[PDB]
Design a protein around this ligand. Structure first.
Ligand SMILES: Nc1nc2c(ncn2[C@@H]2O[C@H](COP(=O)(O)OP(=O)(O)OP(=O)(O)O)[C@@H](O)[C@H]2O)c(=O)[nH]1
Ligand SMILES: Nc1nc2c(ncn2[C@@H]2O[C@H](COP(=O)(O)OP(=O)(O)OP(=O)(O)O)[C@@H](O)[C@H]2O)c(=O)[nH]1
Ligand SMILES: Nc1nc2c(ncn2[C@@H]2O[C@H](COP(=O)(O)OP(=O)(O)O)[C@@H](O)[C@H]2O)c(=O)[nH]1
Ligand SMILES: [Mg+2]
Ligand SMILES: [Mg+2]
Lengths: 435, 143, 142, 58, 15, 431, 47, 437
């Protein structure tokens, strides 16, 4: 019954979705040529959230890989998963947006946005019980800033009431690749804040820190990080496909974490994250893995929750977990005084539990853990993370650096200041609600 | 080049039909501690759920096996062969040692490492009786 | 394979699709010769053996049988005249469920009462939810 | 598409330097494969909707 | 699965 | 046993006839030797619709191979499925028409017409029921355009009761490919409107557009152009030779398509059409087949169908499918595009489901559309004709082979009458 | 409106049980005095 | 004896005949070669073989059916299918070329070369017969052999035999669903002929059976095979009283004298219940009251005309299985006290009940569950005028522009027969309006 369509925008989105769909094929038991392995195929039907079935047992994914450079989509089309994805869902352009929000939103977007919207419409007509859209983009620059926001506009004008969860790779306070990245992040959050539903923030430096503290990896590249967000999204939408205790839908998932329409930016962490060597000398019980999700040195976004208050928390337990020590852990978390919950939210724990144990990637880095917790926090500690990029925007736009590219592109100058005023209003909203 | 030509998107390798991480190791402790030793005399403390106790069905609506004693331990304790013979002779099954040895051999073929508990002997005794009655209904009519 | 109209003669169904194969059929636009809701691959004998008794219901039952004086007299008189009569223990050809024990013909035990539950129901502990004949058919097949 | 003056700027009906089949320039994703002839066996609807019902005591 | 105790019918007035 | 006699006239006619006799050879299952390497009896149940019987089990096609010069005839003899034709059904001329309607219809074509009609009459009297004659020819040429119309007129005079259907390659709006195309198109349409029972009017530019957009295919060439034509030709006569559900032969089709006798110019379409990478992912369903037929991109006539009406429509489905699904889909397409349909004919879409689709495919369909948008082709050809005729260019061979300008003028006038007759129902009301 | 088994004490169960009791009394009378068709046919087959 | 002869004309007729004779062979226990099983046939009774089949002397049981179609594909499918040795291999009469949905081709050009053969075959069947109750003509109104040849066949049958029950089973077009274009022309022309040359005429509708299959049988994608299953079930429910013993047996003569108030109103409405399937079939009780309510539900009508917008005339209720007249009259009393169903004022009692002991036989490879109780509605209603008027609207819209008339003109009949047929159906409207008011 349950379906959800995944749209992957940008190079980061396509790579993170490659690592996502590898884990999904591993979890549901689907070969790269779409067939069930060793003709086993008792009556497992837990792939409908992510796989169709055309006629010959050929389970295609419900994914639209979009991009404007041919490079990473061509890597997908020549790689080991070339026999899984649909070739007209693997949509690519010819000229890359090149870290330019203006070029990715006004020049190259409105040439391919019609085709990708038509493909999303075809997938929506193919499915019958659609729950929402999981959009795996990155703030970054170029396609993930302009084309993703264009997708939000041209998707919310058509669908509407469908949930539109938005995974975004938020730029770190100090580690950042692009230089025009503060410009692109401000210009994409200003245009996605109104049309989005629930925008989950994930940060590369915090994933680097958790991979260096935990695991055993001294040299973590993007492969391990993207596998970690793959585990994140699997722990998110395990309840759609697997049964058990309290199950969260897209609508139950999204109407609990969003108090006000302005504040829709939660944080996603996952804290059994230890490898086999460390997992051998521990027992991973529900109470202490729940306590591990609230540590400042365990988060997947570089902002400590000490300087803020928790609005809402979603506890997504997975595996051999009972709702008794879940109650004990949540009560002792609430009675621990270091965590400060906001005063207008006495009850703030949306708990869902799934029976399916997490699947391990062969040749990976995580271990075969019995349990999993996905912590979806909504602290006001992201206010300083927004304010630091407002500071970057003010410093860059004070002397009008890097604005002549946006001026030469078909874009008007003043909506830089309009977006800056919108972000100032958003930070003022955070400061107003957090008291 | 001195190295190969892997473009680092080929590091994503794990597909079904390869490596097969089925039976490696499952880290962590289960909720029902069915792997560690069971207490003959449980502590006053130590709420650990060692595989003893039951469900709410077994406590609210218990079988009268569980009433006035005899719990599931006494049915899957490994037991002695002459002890099982004495138990079932006191019940009054009245089999000769040839049939008892045949049933014991079948039961120890079904159950690994010898053992043969009273529940396993009862199950194979049910199988044999059902086979005999099915053969009677086979070679005779429908009375 | 075979549609339910030719094989299903009881309320119970050992291979129920559970609400999800029907969407596969409707989304793949399957005619009612490949549909799971209309066609199955169970077989006619498995529907008969899907009961959990290994006995036979007596078609139309004696309704009172305990509340009438005739019920009490037929309880009292033929109490000692029915022990010689046998029971109808299904069909050995139809049951593809009992384990294969080779000898079965010269080994006899005298004093035993036939348990009402099926021995496969009783011996569900050795195969590691409450065991039902749906689980029994899904386990002793395919 | 009848007239449609864009069809001379779609990748069909354009002059283009055609590279080899292993070069990612044009229609390589389709020109690396072949057309399909999947032989699923077919009969009439009368030969498998009206069948010989053996025995079938009424 | 194992069988429970019988339902005692409370024979109050016998004959 | 309703027989169809095939006639392929001209270079393009022969080159699409060879592909057709390959398609319906490996549809029934027939090696190029001539025997039967098949598996089912539904194949060689109705082989007599297109094939005769020989001594050793060989199956000779019931076709004739008409051209005024050996050439493409020997090419299709030398190629695969070229040794299957009977050598007696290989009539050829001496000089060639030189893409001239005068040389094809009056001077050089008329001498070979005796031999072609002798061969056709022999093949016709070798039948038992003889439903029809089908002809593939080359409007814009000289052998298919003129001598093909001679064959049409002579066989219509000989048998004025059976089906006479012409498949026809009409001129394209763009491209070019021949300068005397307006003359050979007007002077052939002038007899196609009166002496044929239905004309299909396939277009090379439309087949190019189909190959580029729907099938990718890069360079399609004439073989892939001919193969879609052959697929449609095998589709339109499916129910004659393959049994199944609710059927329709050519008489049934003609009655349900043409309301008036001078309205038999169709727009054909074959619409299971997957790309080379989508053959393993496209779930063949009746709604998607209906969408691919009724999409304007899949018309094999280059006229745009939504600039007009859809006077009558045929389905011709093949494969196991639900009749409720077919009827709801083809009622839904009418209720959606009710603007592109005439109001004075209630439910002008015929459905006909056969059991056996072409081999290697599970479901298929063959669109046939009698539409008011076919007047665009005649209007454009008339514009080109009057542009060439107001200064009498390229007319001296037509005059010198023996022809007056009055039949040029009356052919243009008759084509304009056909244009006005289609324009009458282009925007007609009800009450 | 809905009807149940006469073992269920919902409707006409009292005199349904009385009628069944009378039929069973007649059946046991024929069984004890040996006019049952089953017994006659079985005696025919045996003798 | 009460023998009946079936005449399946047209492709729809012969496919419905395939389903109907499968159902008959299965419910009388006849193998698909005319033979009894020869080991379980020791049980006598069931004088049904003598009614619908006939001896061949030794042991083969050929049916009393004539399968005619002008094109030899579906009849050849019958001849090469599993029911090949069952039929006498000359009552499967076929022509050379079809009528190609043309009433003129079926009635003037192709029919008058094979109609002598088909009356020769009907004459030989009737001479084999002894006490012929009548003919059952199975055809579609859509056109061709089922319209022109069917109408001329019924003309010749009414001229030759006379005073016999000529029951019709005709497939009527839907309000929106049709598989042809000249179908309104053919329906008007065949109704003009079949109005005055036939007794009781049932008209089934494909869209209505689609609605039944999609709602109750839960078949979202049904086929003509399943439609023929339901139609064959209706036919078997009609003719079960001529074959199996029952509490109240209603044959064709009682049937017509109870359902036809006036000789031009022989157009009843068919409805079969229960039509629920397998999984949602054995969780219910299937009572006589609830199956009667299922028949009287307007959505269960198998014609696509609402009986709420009209008035009933006479309902014939054919029950099958372990059904008692006790709760049959209880259910009839509940229907009569229910005010939604309105009867006409000049028919105070309006129910003809026929109870048969035989339950319906479930077909393997079918969609109907094995039920123990069933009932067939055969009510006569003034609501068929809506379907006739929709047909006249389509005919007027097509005939205003004189489209498709030239085939009919060139293949026989002139242009005046269209006007004559339209006037006949307008008179039928006017008469139905009088009988309703
Ligand atoms: N987690 C994760 N982040 C990535 C990955 N690849 C790129 N990024 C982030 O994406 C940011 C830049 O956006 P890109 O994805 O590289 O660019 P784009 O979205 O394709 O848009 P263009 O710049 O126009 O090509 C970088 O700062 C990275 O932090 C990846 O594989 N995993
Ligand atoms: N209920 C039902 N109707 C059918 C079936 N087959 C065909 N029909 C009806 O038949 C109509 C089509 O016209 P046909 O009856 O096939 O015409 P024909 O009898 O073959 O005569 P010709 O047109 O000359 O070939 C459709 O409107 C269908 O409703 C069937 O199997 N079941
Ligand atoms: N579709 C298709 N068209 C063809 C083929 N060969 C030739 N033509 C067309 O036929 C036209 C010329 O007709 P022509 O061969 O001179 O006719 P002929 O003189 O009677 O043989 C050109 O416009 C071509 O587009 C072919 O193999 N396929
Ligand atoms: Mg990029
Ligand atoms: Mg026909």
């Amino acid at each position: 019954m349950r379906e959800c369509i995944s749209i992957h925008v940008g190079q980061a989105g396509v790579q993170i979705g490659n690592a996502c769909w590898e884990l999904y094929c591993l979890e549901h038991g689907i070969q790269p040529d779409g067939q069930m392995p060793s003709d086993k195929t008792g009556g497992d039907d837990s792939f409908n959230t992510f796989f169709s079935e055309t006629g010959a047992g050929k389970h295609v994914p419900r994914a639209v890989f979009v991009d404007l450079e041919p490079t990473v989509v061509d890597e997908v089309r020549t790689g080991t998963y070339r026999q899984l994805f649909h070739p007209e869902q693997l949509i690519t352009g010819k000229e890359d947006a090149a870290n330019n929000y203006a070029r990715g939103h006004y020049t190259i977007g409105k040439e391919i946005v019609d085709l990708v919207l038509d493909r999303i419409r075809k997938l929506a007509d193919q499915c019958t019980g659609l729950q929402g859209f999981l959009i795996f983009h990155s703030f970054g620059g170029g396609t993930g800033s302009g084309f993703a926001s264009l997708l939000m506009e041209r998707l919310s004008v058509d669908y509407g009431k469908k949930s539109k969860l938005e995974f975004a790779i938020y730029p770190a306070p100090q580690i950042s690749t692009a230089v025009v990245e503060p410009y692109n992040t401000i210009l994409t959050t200003h245009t996605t804040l109104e049309h989005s539903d629930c925008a989950f923030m994930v940060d590369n430096e915090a994933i680097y820190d958790i991979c260096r503290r935990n695991l055993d990896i001294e040299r973590p590249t993007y492969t391990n990080l993207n596998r970690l967000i793959a585990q994140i999204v699997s722990s998110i939408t395990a309840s759609l496909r697997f049964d058990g205790a309290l199950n969260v839908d897209l609508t139950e998932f999204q109407t609990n974490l969003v108090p006000y329409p302005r504040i829709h930016f939660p944080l996603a962490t996952y804290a059994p994250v230890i490898s086999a060597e460390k997992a051998y000398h521990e027992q991973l019980s529900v109470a202490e893995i729940t306590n591990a999700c609230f540590e400042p040195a365990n988060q997947m976004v570089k902002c400590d929750p000490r300087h803020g208050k928790y609005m809402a928390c979603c506890m997504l337990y997975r595996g051999d977990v009972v709702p008794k020590d879940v109650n004990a852990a949540i009560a002792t978390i609430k009675t621990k005084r270091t965590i400060q919950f906001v005063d207008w939210c006495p009850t703030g724990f949306k708990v869902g539990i799934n029976y399916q144990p997490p699947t391990v990637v062969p040749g990976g880095d995580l271990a075969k853990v019995q349990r999993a917790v996905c912590m979806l926090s909504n602290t006001t500690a992201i206010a300083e993370a927004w304010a630091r990029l407002d500071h970057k925007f003010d410093l860059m736009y004070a002397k009008r650096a890097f604005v002549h590219w946006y001026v030469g592109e078909g874009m008007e100058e003043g909506e830089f200041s309009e977006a800056r005023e919108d972000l100032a209003a958003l930070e003022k909203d955070y400061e107003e609600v957090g008291v | 080049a001195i190295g190969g030509h892997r473009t680092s998107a080929q590091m994503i390798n794990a597909v079904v039909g390869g490596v097969s991480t089925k039976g490696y190791r499952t880290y962590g402790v289960p909720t029902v501690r069915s792997d560690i030793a069971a207490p003959r005399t449980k502590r006053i403390s130590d709420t650990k759920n060692y595989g003893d106790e039951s469900d709410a069905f077994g406590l609210i609506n218990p079988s009268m096996y569980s009433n006035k004693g005899i719990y599931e331990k006494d049915f899957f304790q490994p037991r002695e062969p002459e002890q099982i013979k004495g138990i079932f002779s006191d019940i009054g099954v009245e089999m000769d040692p040839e049939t008892f040895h045949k049933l014991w051999s079948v039961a120890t073929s079904r159950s690994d490492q010898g053992q043969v508990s009273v529940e396993s002997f009862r199950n194979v005794l049910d199988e044999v009786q059902a086979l005999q009655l099915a053969d009677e209904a086979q070679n005779l009519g429908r009375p | 394979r075979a549609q339910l109209a030719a094989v299903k003669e009881g309320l119970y169904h050992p291979s129920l699709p559970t609400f999800r194969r029907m969407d596969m059929d409707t989304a793949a636009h399957r005619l009612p010769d490949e549909h799971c809701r209309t066609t199955t691959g169970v077989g006619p004998a498995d529907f008969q053996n899907a009961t959990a008794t290994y006995f036979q219901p007596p078609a139309n039952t004696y309704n009172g049988a305990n509340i009438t004086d005739t019920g009490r007299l037929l309880r009292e008189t033929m109490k000692d005249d029915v022990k010689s009569l046998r029971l109808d223990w299904a069909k050995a050809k139809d049951i593809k469920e009992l384990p294969q024990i080779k000898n079965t013909g010269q080994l006899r035990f005298s004093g035993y009462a036939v348990r009402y539950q099926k021995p496969a129901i009783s011996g569900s502990w050795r195969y590691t939810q409450r065991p039902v004949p749906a689980n029994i058919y899904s386990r002793y097949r395919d | 598409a009848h007239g449609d003056p864009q069809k001379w700027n779609l990748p069909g009906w354009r002059i283009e330097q055609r590279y080899a089949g292993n070069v990612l320039i044009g229609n390589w994703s389709e020109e690396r494969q072949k057309f399909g002839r999947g032989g699923e066996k077919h009969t009439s609807t009368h030969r498998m909707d009206y069948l010989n019902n053996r025995n079938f005591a009424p | 699965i194992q069988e429970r105790a019988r339902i005692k019918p409370r024979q109050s007035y016998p004959r | 046993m309703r027989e169809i006699v095939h006639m392929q006239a001209g270079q393009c006619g022969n080159q699409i006839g060879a592909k057709f006799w390959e398609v319906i050879s490996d549809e029934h299952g027939i090696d190029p030797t001539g025997t039967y390497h098949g598996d089912s009896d539904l194949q060689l149940e109705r082989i007599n619709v297109y094939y005769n019987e020989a001594t050793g089990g060989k199956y000779v096609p019931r076709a004739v191979l008409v051209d005024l010069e050996p050439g493409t005839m020997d090419s299709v003899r030398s190629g695969p499925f070229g040794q299957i034709f009977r050598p007696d059904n290989f009539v050829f001329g001496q000089s060639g028409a030189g893409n001239n309607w005068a040389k094809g219809h009056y001077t050089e074509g008329a001498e070979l017409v005796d031999s072609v009609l002798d061969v056709v009459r022999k093949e016709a009297e070798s039948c038992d029921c003889l439903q029809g004659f089908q002809l593939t020819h080359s409007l814009g040429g000289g052998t298919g355009s003129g001598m093909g119309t001679l064959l049409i007129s002579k066989i219509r005079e000989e048998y004025p009761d059976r089906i006479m259907n012409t498949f026809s390659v009409v001129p394209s709006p763009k491209v070019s490919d021949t300068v005397v195309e307006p003359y050979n198109a007007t002077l052939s349409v002038h007899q196609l409107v009166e002496n044929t029972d239905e004309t299909y009017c396939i277009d090379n530019e439309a087949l190019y557009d189909i190959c580029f957009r729907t099938l990718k295919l890069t360079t399609p060439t004439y073989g892939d152009l001919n193969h879609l034509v052959s697929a449609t030709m095998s589709g339109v006569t499916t129910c004659l030779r393959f049994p199944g559900q609710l059927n329709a032969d050519l008489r049934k089709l003609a009655v349900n398509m043409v309301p008036f006798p001078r309205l038999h110019f169709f727009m054909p379409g074959f619409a299971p059409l997957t790309s080379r990478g989508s053959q393993q992912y496209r779930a063949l369903t009746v709604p998607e087949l209906t969408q691919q037929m009724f999409d304007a991109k899949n018309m094999m006539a280059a006229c745009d169908p939504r600039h007009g009406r859809y006077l009558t429509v045929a389905a011709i489905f093949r494969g196991r499918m639900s009749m409720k699904e077919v009827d709801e889909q083809m009622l839904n397409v009418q209720n959606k595009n009710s603007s592109y349909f005439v109001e004075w004919i209630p439910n002008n879409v015929k459905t006909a489901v056969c059991d056996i689709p072409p081999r290697g495919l599970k479901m298929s369909a063959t669109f046939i559309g009698n539409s008011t948008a076919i007047q665009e082709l005649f209007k454009r050809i008339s514009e080109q004709f009057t542009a060439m005729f107001r200064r009498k260019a390229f007319l001296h061979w037509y005059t010198g082979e023996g022809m007056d300008e009055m039949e040029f003028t009356e052919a243009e006038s008759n084509m304009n009458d056909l244009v006005s007759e289609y324009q009458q129902y282009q925007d007609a009301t009800a009450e | 409106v809905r009807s149940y088994n006469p073992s269920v004490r919902v409707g006409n169960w009292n005199e349904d049980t009385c009628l069944e009791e009378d039929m069973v009394k007649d059946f046991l009378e024929k069984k004890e005095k040996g006019e049952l068709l089953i017994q006659k046919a079985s005696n025919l087959r045996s003798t």
